[PDB]
Structures are given as C-alpha cells and as structure tokens.
Design a protein around this ligand. Structure first.
Ligand SMILES: [Cl-]
Lengths: 153, 143, 151
C-alpha cells in the first residue's frame, strides 16, 4: 500500500463538459489507505483508456483504480482495454465487486468490469456511479493489503 | 451505415472526436475512429479519402472560424457537389456564442453527406442535436 | 505530477463563450509529464477563490489559471490568488509579463501573480490564447525545477 493512479473514463467529462463525481470518491478512499494524494485522470472511452493504463503500468504503480465504461453501451470498452493490458484476471474480485452493489442496484450484473495484475500493478475496474464505486472500494478494502503483499512476493 | 470523423486541430488530445464517435454509434454507425488532422492539406486528404470510400456521412470538427488557418469550409466546399444551406444555418442556430462566426457548411459529395461542426465540445453537442432530427431522412433522400 | 487549470471567465462559465485557453494549457501539461486534468471554468470573482481553495486542499502540484488579471472592473483573479497564496514568486510573474514583449506591449497590464499555497504552485496566465502560449514558454525550463524546489 503506497502508489496509485485513478483513471475515470468519460468522454464528456474528459472534454471538460461534465462532472467527475467518482474520481474524488476514489481519491479520498486512497488517502484513507496509505496512498496520497492521487488526482483523477479523466479520459475518453477507447484508445485513451489503453494509453492511460499502459502508461500507469510502465510507471510501476502498485494500484490502478478505474471508474466507468464497463457497461454494455456501444461506447463502453473499458474491460477490453483493461484485459489487453493485463497479464491475467482476478475473477473472484470482479464478481464480488458486482455483487457488492447488488442488493439493491439489480443492474449491477451488467457491469463488465475486470480486475487483474499487469507486471506488479493491480488494476481494478469499478462502475461509473458514485454508489457502485463506494460499494466496490468497500470490497477492495477487505483484500487490498493481502493482494499487495502477495503480488510483491 | 458508414462514417468518418475528421477533427481539424492546429495543434496537430482529441476531446471532440470521441464525443462524435459515440453519437454515431448511438445512431446506427460504426465504431469510427476519429482522424485528427492539421488545417489545410490534411483536411483535403481526409475529405477526399472518405468521399472515394463512398461513406454515408462525414463529420468534421474545427477550423470553421476566421483565424488565419481556419479553412475547413473551403476544403469542404472544394469536394462538395452542392451545399445544404438550411442545415449549416440550423447548426449555427443550435445551442446559444461568438460563432455567428462559424462558417461551416454542409453538403453532398457524390452519395456522401458532409457536415461541418465547430471545434468546441458544446458546438459539437448542439450541432449533433440538430443532426439527430434530420439525419435518417437526409440519408434516405440522398440514396 | 498533477495539475488543475482554472479558466476564469463568467461568459465561458455560463456557456456563452467557448473556452479555447483551457485545452491549450491541458496539452502543454501532458508533454511535461502530467497525468491529470480537465480544465475547470469558473466565473470572475469569488468562484476563483473557491476553485483555488478546492485545488489546494486536494493537494495538486500545480494550478494554472487563465484570465481575469487585467484592470477592468471585473478582473479580480490576482486578488483571489494572493488571498490563497502563502507568498508570491515575483520573478516568475515578471517573466510571464515580459514574454509578450515587444509584440504586445499591453502585456505589462496583466496583474497576474505566481506563488505557493501549501505545497501547490499557482501561476496566473492572461485570458488570451497568445498570452497563455507566451507564458507556457517561460514555464518550459523552470517548472520542473520549481516543483522540485517546492518538494
Ligand atoms: Cl461503468
């Protein structure tokens, strides 16, 4: 637990014509867990996602947290770009993040987020909504320290 | 349906291209990758290639004002068979901005519809909102 | 590194004008190894103070503002900036003013300041895309060292 990036995926927000409410949530939670102070990078759907992830992995960050672009809309390609960068996926973590918001938000099941490892960087896809983000960070909090420990040895 | 997106930037990140690409997917196109190009010859090249390819629609963004390098409308008129003045006017009248100054045109080149949009995300938004109400009919009439 | 851009214009904030300077500043930051930002766009006056305080609290490495540094009644960017700053960096402000000369002798009328608030570097740029490009030229060979000195 020490270094991280945040990538918020929204073409409108990235163009500066829309609010990013998810990024600040992630930044605050990271501050509570031994990182600090990370500022959101807001990028458009598509190639800019690949570009941000490769850049962050090649920086050797411990953790990348993404928000948005995981649904089933024409333009949601975050999972594809993430899988491309990943060495492998962590299915149980992605499933638990989906189930976290479920009670509750039944459409949770439509988020196609993955999590995985690339090099020694842990990557987490979260949904593009403030509640889905907070619920998924709650899931991550139960396992982050262990996950980072394991990746390091 | 087929399309190309030409983002005209003197700088040549593209903020408008992905917005237009997303709109087009909503309207039955694509996955279209925006081509970001400099003013001038590169605008010509992107238009000519798209017209040759026989795409249904070309959307451009930027280079429509009165700065020394703003020649998107000139390059557009150069490839058009004819202009559709009401559509350019409707795009200018959407949204309201200094732009009254956008000299964008719209028109048909062959069986390809070309639409000039301003180089701002808000101008693009407003423009696309106009297009949303006429695009199906326009493509039908051209065919 | 992280940055915020605060474009200061009531008309741009209102959607009445387009923000052309914000995107110019954003692209320059990316070439200098910044991950970051959307600009922000805020009205003249108190919103400026709001935006700087939010950005200083969040702990960003740099804030670049654009506009509101002139001598018209609604130009209050320098005021709100000095209110947030712990201290000014006079030589950087001066260097930014001079970057417009000799071509735009009215460049000397910008009352823009630079300084540090906490661990955040703040730089006032003028509201014209030419004053902005001219100011980024100054920053090119001092910004990395500035940030290193602050840290
Ligand atoms: Cl999502």
């Amino acid at each position: 637990t020490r270094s991280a990036r945040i990538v918020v995926v929204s073409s409108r927000a990235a163009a500066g014509v829309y609010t990013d409410d998810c990024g600040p949530i992630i930044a605050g939670w990271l501050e509570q867990h031994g990182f600090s102070s990370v500022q959101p990078q807001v990028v458009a759907d598509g190639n800019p996602v690949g570009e941000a992830l490769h850049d962050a992995v090649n920086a050797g960050v411990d953790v990348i947290i993404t928000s948005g672009g995981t649904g089933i809309s024409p333009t949601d390609t975050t999972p594809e770009h993430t899988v491309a960068v990943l060495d492998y996926v962590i299915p149980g973590l992605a499933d638990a993040i989906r189930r976290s918001g479920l009670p509750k938000v039944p459409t949770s099941v439509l988020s196609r987020g993955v999590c995985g490892v690339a090099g020694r960087t842990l990557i987490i896809n979260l949904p593009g909504s403030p509640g889905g983000v907070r619920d998924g960070l709650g899931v991550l909090a139960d396992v982050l320290d262990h996950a980072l420990e394991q990746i390091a040895g």
